[PDB]
């Protein structure tokens, strides 16, 4: 019991494809809008790129990378290497390495700080390394 419409109005395309209850309604309105709707799913595959831009704020996809990039901010979910940048403040995650680099570091909590290590700890410093109790 299907319906199928393909308009062209002053508003724009109103392509809906309806079952008895379900549907897949798309538009392209002349007021600058693009909408889509479904009742089950939206899939969209490709072979090399999926690039989504609003004036240099990308979400790009390659066969191996995923970028979530703007001006001066990025997440590069490469294969086996994750970077998070605000220059200059980095978090680089590797196969067997977590590095966290910055200028300053503030670490607050409320109850506990368990810092275990199954082998040695090499803390280095300069002039002060203070504590309290």
């Amino acid at each position: 019991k299907a319906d199928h419409i393909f308009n062209l109005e002053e508003q724009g395309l109103l392509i809906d494809i309806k079952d008895d209850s379900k549907g897949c309604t798309t538009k392209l309105e002349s007021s600058g809008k693009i909408t889509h709707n479904a009742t089950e799913s939206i899939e969209s595959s490709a072979d090399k790129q999926i690039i989504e831009n609003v004036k240099d704020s990308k979400i790009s996809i390659t066969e191996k990378e995923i970028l979530l990039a703007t001006k001066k901010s990025s997440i590069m979910l490469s294969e086996d290497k994750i970077v998070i940048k605000i220059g200059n403040s980095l978090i680089i995650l590797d196969d067997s390495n977590i590095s966290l680099e910055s200028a300053t570091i503030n670490i607050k909590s409320s109850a506990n700080i368990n810092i275990q290590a199954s082998q040695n700890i090499d803390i280095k410093s300069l002039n002060n390394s203070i504590k309290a109790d």
Binding site: A2, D3, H4, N7, L8
Partner: protein, 93 residues
């Protein structure tokens, strides 16, 4: 055009000599506006066996519809063109 004489029509036939008859005019239709020439303005061509087509063009007192409809068992194709809405395509059941 190739629209041959279907059955169930009505024709004037002369018999111009012995063993020579001819076909002249048509006294028949299949498509007529059965309304009072103020409600509708039909200009159409029915086509095909079972008459499941229209190249219709209806102008009522309100709108103008150009249409290419089809009726089948549980399939209603169309191609509508109005002046108020636009260009359509439909498939219903």
């Amino acid at each position: 055009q190739f629209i041959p004489l279907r059955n169930d029509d009505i024709i004037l036939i002369e018999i111009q000599s012995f063993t020579k008859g001819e076909i002249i005019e048509l006294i028949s239709n299949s498509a007529i506006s059965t309304k009072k020439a103020q409600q509708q303005l039909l200009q159409r061509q029915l086509l095909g066996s079972k008459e499941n087509c229209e190249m219709a063009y209806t102008q009522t007192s309100d709108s103008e519809t150009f249409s290419l409809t089809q009726v089948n068992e549980d399939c209603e194709n169309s191609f509508l063109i109005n002046d108020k809405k636009g260009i359509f395509l439909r498939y219903k059941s």
